[PDB]
Design a protein around this ligand. Sequence first.
Ligand SMILES: *c1nc(F)c(C#N)cc1F
Ligand SMILES: [Zn+2]
Length: 198
Amino acid sequence: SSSVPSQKTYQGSYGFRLGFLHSGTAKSVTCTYSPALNKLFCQLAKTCPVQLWVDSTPPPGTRVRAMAIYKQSQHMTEVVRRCPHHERCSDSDGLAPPQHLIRVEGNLRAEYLDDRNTFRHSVVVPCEPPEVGSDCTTIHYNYMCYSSCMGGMNRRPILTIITLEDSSGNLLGRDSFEVRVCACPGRDRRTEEENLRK
Ligand SMILES: *c1nc(F)c(C#N)cc1F
Ligand SMILES: [Zn+2]
């Protein structure tokens, strides 16, 4: 078992926080975010856009890191990893180790860390300013196991912790959201929001 990174929201000096698109809950949806649950629902290995919002521009060399932890207290010391099936299915893009649950899509500067002390996985990219005509920068994540994968997440809820870091890895900001990776994200978001309203 491993030490548990903080999940405490921390806007920091740059006013760092996440944002999510409004994709709705139709059958064709592959990634959908519930503000009422603070929970992203997505399909396996599909694009998950996450917005990075800041009040002021952080220095060049600022990076942004994603890491998964188990939400429940009896599981939070366990490293989140891909299940024994998906870690062996040879689907690495050449950067992501096959054990890593979270990948970054479409960024050749993504770096993947296996922490030498905690053995936790994370993926980190340079934080870049918004493009022209945009108010935020967007990262595309992929989740490479289902929440239900036996021997992996095994139906246990996870959180993704997003940290803004300086070039040394020191904390500048932190935010987080729950994730369910499932075949029917729109149907599952509708169900869980309906459960919350009852
Ligand atoms: C990461 N890096 C940046 F440079 C900005 C700006 N501006 C935002 C961010 F999330
Ligand atoms: Zn799996």
